[PDB]
Design a protein around this ligand. Structure first.
Ligand SMILES: CC(C)c1cc(Oc2c(Cl)cc(CC(=O)O)cc2Cl)ccc1O
Length: 253
């Protein structure tokens, strides 16, 4: 026990004005690159749940038509982060390929609406778990909805979502990177700045930070699992339906 005491005995350092700068740049890089009022729903006849793993081409088409902008927004987000913009093109590619699905999934998960039990892709199209699943994501769809439901309680604000994206972007998990050190350092700086921003928000939730950190694992699973679905998508879907950017970002794996 002694949880209440231990909790209160913990030091909650606020953000140092080095971290407040990061937290501001990042927060705006995020806000300016991610756009519920006039959100159009995706027709219930599209992707309505033989072949246990068949991909509904119609649904798939609807999602690939809006994926290029979604991917462009993540790239735009990265470009607005100093420590990223200064990296070699090759590095930016590897980083982007390594976190694009995660960030896109995070943005989808936070736009989750419990009322309608849907997600809003590109901040406009509202999709039901079934549709996104038949459209190609399969279980990954189940995973993003599961994450979206659980993130409602966290009340993440633009900054937490923003730093969470920076943390995902600045990873040295993939190979072929050049500036491993500089990225590593940006990672640690964002994590630290992120943690202090969470101390500042004072969430009425027990072990919030540790829990929010576990969401990163959820997103990386979604990311990794997405690479599989993508392969399955290339098998089951006409190549003409795959936009160029979509292919560059998820192929070669
Ligand atoms: C079906 C297939 C084309 C596919 C859909 C897919 O759906 C999403 C889309 Cl379009 C856009 C976003 C992010 C956003 O809301 O901007 C987030 C998500 Cl999860 C992600 C990866 C994929 O390979």
């Amino acid at each position: 026990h002694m949880e209440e005491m231990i909790r209160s005995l913990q030091q909650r350092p606020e953000p140092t004005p080095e971290e407040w700068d990061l937290i501001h740049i990042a927060t705006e890089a995020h806000r300016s690159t991610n756009a519920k009022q006039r959100r159009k729903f995706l027709p219930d006849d599209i992707g309505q749940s033989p072949d246990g793993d068949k991909v509904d081409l119609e649904a798939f088409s609807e999602f690939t038509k809006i994926i290029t902008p979604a991917i462009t927004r993540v790239v735009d987000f990265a470009k607005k982060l100093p420590m990223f913009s200064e990296l070699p093109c090759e590095d930016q590619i590897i980083l982007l390929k390594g976190c694009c699905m995660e960030i896109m999934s995070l943005r989808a998960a936070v736009r989750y609406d419990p009322e309608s039990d849907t997600l809003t892709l590109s901040g406009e199209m509202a999709v039901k778990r079934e549709q996104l699943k038949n459209g190609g994501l399969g279980v990954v769809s189940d995973a993003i909805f599961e994450l979206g439901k659980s993130l409602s309680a966290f009340n993440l604000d633009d900054t937490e979502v923003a730093l969470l994206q920076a943390v995902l972007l600045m990873s040295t998990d993939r190979s072929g990177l050049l500036c491993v050190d500089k990225i590593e350092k940006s990672q640690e700086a964002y994590l630290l700045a992120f943690e202090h921003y969470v101390n500042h928000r004072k969430h009425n939730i027990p072990h919030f930070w540790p829990k929010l950190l576990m969401k990163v694992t959820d997103l990386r699973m979604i990311g990794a699992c997405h690479a599989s679905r993508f392969l399955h998508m290339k098998v089951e879907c006409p190549t003409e339906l795959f936009p160029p950017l979509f292919l560059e970002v998820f192929e070669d794996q």
